[PDB]
Design an enzyme around this catalytic site. Structure first.
Site, short mmCIF file in Angstrom:
data_model
loop_
_atom_site.label_atom_id
_atom_site.label_comp_id
_atom_site.label_asym_id
_atom_site.label_seq_id
_atom_site.Cartn_x
_atom_site.Cartn_y
_atom_site.Cartn_z
N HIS A 1 -7.69 21.13 49.77
CA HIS A 1 -8.62 22.28 49.98
C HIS A 1 -9.08 22.31 51.21
O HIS A 1 -8.94 21.63 52.54
CB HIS A 1 -9.52 21.85 48.72
CG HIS A 1 -9.18 21.30 47.63
ND1 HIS A 1 -9.41 19.64 47.55
CD2 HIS A 1 -8.65 21.42 46.54
CE1 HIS A 1 -8.98 19.11 46.45
NE2 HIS A 1 -8.33 20.07 45.74
N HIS B 1 -11.98 22.92 52.79
CA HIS B 1 -13.93 22.27 52.19
C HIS B 1 -14.94 23.12 53.22
O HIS B 1 -14.82 23.85 54.16
CB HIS B 1 -14.62 20.76 52.70
CG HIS B 1 -13.72 19.52 51.92
ND1 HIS B 1 -13.97 18.87 50.87
CD2 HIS B 1 -12.33 20.23 51.27
CE1 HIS B 1 -13.66 18.16 50.10
NE2 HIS B 1 -12.30 18.83 50.45
N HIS C 1 -15.56 21.34 48.53
CA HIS C 1 -15.27 22.46 48.49
C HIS C 1 -15.76 23.73 48.98
O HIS C 1 -16.76 24.36 48.50
CB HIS C 1 -14.11 23.04 47.26
CG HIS C 1 -13.28 21.47 46.55
ND1 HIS C 1 -12.77 21.48 46.24
CD2 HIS C 1 -13.71 20.51 47.32
CE1 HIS C 1 -12.50 20.22 45.68
NE2 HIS C 1 -12.05 19.75 46.83
N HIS D 1 -14.67 24.45 40.23
CA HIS D 1 -13.54 23.93 40.71
C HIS D 1 -12.09 24.96 40.33
O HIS D 1 -12.14 24.63 39.06
CB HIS D 1 -13.52 22.80 41.01
CG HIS D 1 -11.74 22.31 41.81
ND1 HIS D 1 -11.86 22.22 42.85
CD2 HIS D 1 -10.84 21.67 41.13
CE1 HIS D 1 -10.42 21.90 42.96
NE2 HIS D 1 -9.88 21.68 41.94
N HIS E 1 -12.99 27.94 43.84
CA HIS E 1 -13.84 27.78 44.60
C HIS E 1 -12.86 28.80 45.89
O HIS E 1 -11.74 28.46 45.23
CB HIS E 1 -13.40 26.48 45.32
CG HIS E 1 -14.84 25.39 44.19
ND1 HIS E 1 -14.43 24.42 44.51
CD2 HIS E 1 -15.61 26.24 43.54
CE1 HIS E 1 -15.50 23.59 43.62
NE2 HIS E 1 -16.56 24.62 43.04
N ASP F 1 -9.42 26.22 47.51
CA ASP F 1 -8.97 25.27 46.43
C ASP F 1 -7.80 25.74 46.13
O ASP F 1 -6.98 26.75 45.90
CB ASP F 1 -9.03 25.59 45.21
CG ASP F 1 -10.65 25.30 44.22
OD1 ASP F 1 -11.31 24.21 44.72
OD2 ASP F 1 -10.95 25.43 43.51
N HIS G 1 -5.43 15.55 50.01
CA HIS G 1 -6.18 14.20 48.89
C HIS G 1 -5.48 12.98 48.77
O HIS G 1 -4.08 13.59 49.45
CB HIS G 1 -7.06 14.65 47.93
CG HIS G 1 -8.52 15.39 48.18
ND1 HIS G 1 -9.48 15.01 48.10
CD2 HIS G 1 -8.70 16.49 48.55
CE1 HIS G 1 -10.37 15.58 49.11
NE2 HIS G 1 -10.32 16.93 49.33
N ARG H 1 -9.71 12.20 50.60
CA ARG H 1 -9.74 12.08 51.15
C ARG H 1 -8.03 11.95 52.38
O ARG H 1 -9.25 10.98 53.09
CB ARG H 1 -10.61 13.22 52.42
CG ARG H 1 -12.08 13.66 51.07
CD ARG H 1 -13.11 13.64 51.62
NE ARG H 1 -13.58 14.78 50.75
CZ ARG H 1 -15.12 15.40 51.51
NH1 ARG H 1 -15.15 16.03 52.45
NH2 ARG H 1 -15.78 16.17 49.97
CU LIG Z 1 -10.68 18.83 49.28
ZN LIG Z 2 -12.56 23.57 44.55
#
Ligand SMILES: [Cu+]
Ligand SMILES: [Zn+2]
Ligand SMILES: [Cu+]
Ligand SMILES: [Zn+2]
Lengths: 153, 152
Positions: free
Chosen positions: A46, A48, A63, A71, A80, A83, A120, A143
Site C-alpha cells: 500500500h 501510506h 494507509h 481499508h 483507501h 490500498d 508488508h 512493514r
Molecule cells: Cu501498508
Molecule cells: Zn488500507
C-alpha cells in the site's frame, strides 16, 4: 505523461524498485517493477500517508486515505486511495509487479508523490477479516521495506 | 502549516534529517535539520529535479530549474529554484537552518517528490565563468540525497 519511481529499502533482505506511470490527466497509473528478498507468498502492498522515514517505515503513517473510507482493495468496493492489495513472491523470493490502478494518481487530489510505498510481511485480507484490524490495515502485519515516491524522468 | 521531511540516507557514512516548513501557500519555506558523516568545510546544498534514487544520487537529474535559468546563489535573481547555497560542517557535522521563498511545498515550485542533495564540495554560486559554474556551481559529486516527502 508523468512518471514516478520508488526505491524500497528495509531493515532486512527486502529491497526493490517500483515504477509508476500515468499517461493521462487523472487516468490509470501503471505500476510495475520488482521486489526481492521476500518469503514465498502474498504481501500487503500500500501507499501510506507520509514520505517520512525518520523512523524507518514506521513513521510512514497509516494507509493513504484522503477520503475517510475503510481499508479494502477489490474493484468497486470501498477502500483507501493507497490500498494496492497484494504482490506475490515466487520461490526465489522475488515478486515481479505489474498492476494498473485508477484510484491513485500522479497529479491532483489523490497524488501519491511525496508519500511512502510499503510492502508488508503478511497478506492483506482486503478487509474481509472480521476484527477492527481488517478495516484499517487488512491485517498485513509489519512493514518489510518502503520508500518515498518521487518524480522521475 | 504544510511540512515535508527528508532523510539523507543512501550509501556512505553520511546520514541526516532535514525538515521543511511552510505556513501559508507559496510563502517562504523554513529549512532546518542536521547532517553528519560529511567532510569538513563548505558543501553545496540544492534541490534537484528528480526524486529518483535508483542509481544513487546520479538519478536525481540536474538542479530543480523550472524557469530555465543559470545556477546562482539564493539571493541572486539569476538562480535555479533549487539553489540553497552552502552548508558548513565542522567532525563531519553540519547544523542546517535556512529560509527561502523561491522554493515551495505547494504550486509551481513544489520541491515535494524531488531530491535534496548535499555535495562533496562548496558551491561557487555560479560566478566561475565555465559551464559547470552555470550548472552546479562546481559543487562536486553528491555525497548524500533523499527524496522530499510529506511529513506529519
Ligand atoms: Cu501498508
Ligand atoms: Zn488500507
Ligand atoms: Cu546540486
Ligand atoms: Zn543550481
Amino acid at each position: 505523461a508523468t512518471k514516478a519511481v520508488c526505491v524500497l529499502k528495509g531493515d532486512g533482505p527486502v529491497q526493490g524498485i517500483i515504477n509508476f506511470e500515468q499517461k493521462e490527466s487523472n487516468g490509470p497509473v501503471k505500476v510495475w517493477g520488482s521486489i526481492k528478498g521476500l518469503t514465498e507468498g502474498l504481501h500487503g502492498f500500500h501507499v501510506h500517508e507520509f514520505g517520512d522515514n525518520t523512523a524507518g517505515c514506521t513513521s510512514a503513517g497509516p494507509h493513504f486515505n484522503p477520503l475517510s473510507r475503510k481499508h479494502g482493495g477489490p474493484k468497486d468496493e470501498e477502500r483507501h486511495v493507497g490500498d494496492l492489495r497484494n504482490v506475490t513472491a515466487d520461490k526465489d523470493g522475488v515478486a515481479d509487479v505489474s498492476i494498473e490502478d485508477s484510484v491513485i494518481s500522479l497529479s491532483g487530489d489523490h497524488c501519491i508523490i511525496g508519500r511512502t510505498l510499503v510492502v508488508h510481511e503478511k497478506a492483506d485480507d482486503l478487509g474481509k477479516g472480521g476484527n477492527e484490524e481488517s478495516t484499517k490495515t487488512g491485517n498485513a502485519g509489519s512493514r518489510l521495506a518502503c520508500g518515498v515516491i518521487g518524480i522521475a524522468q
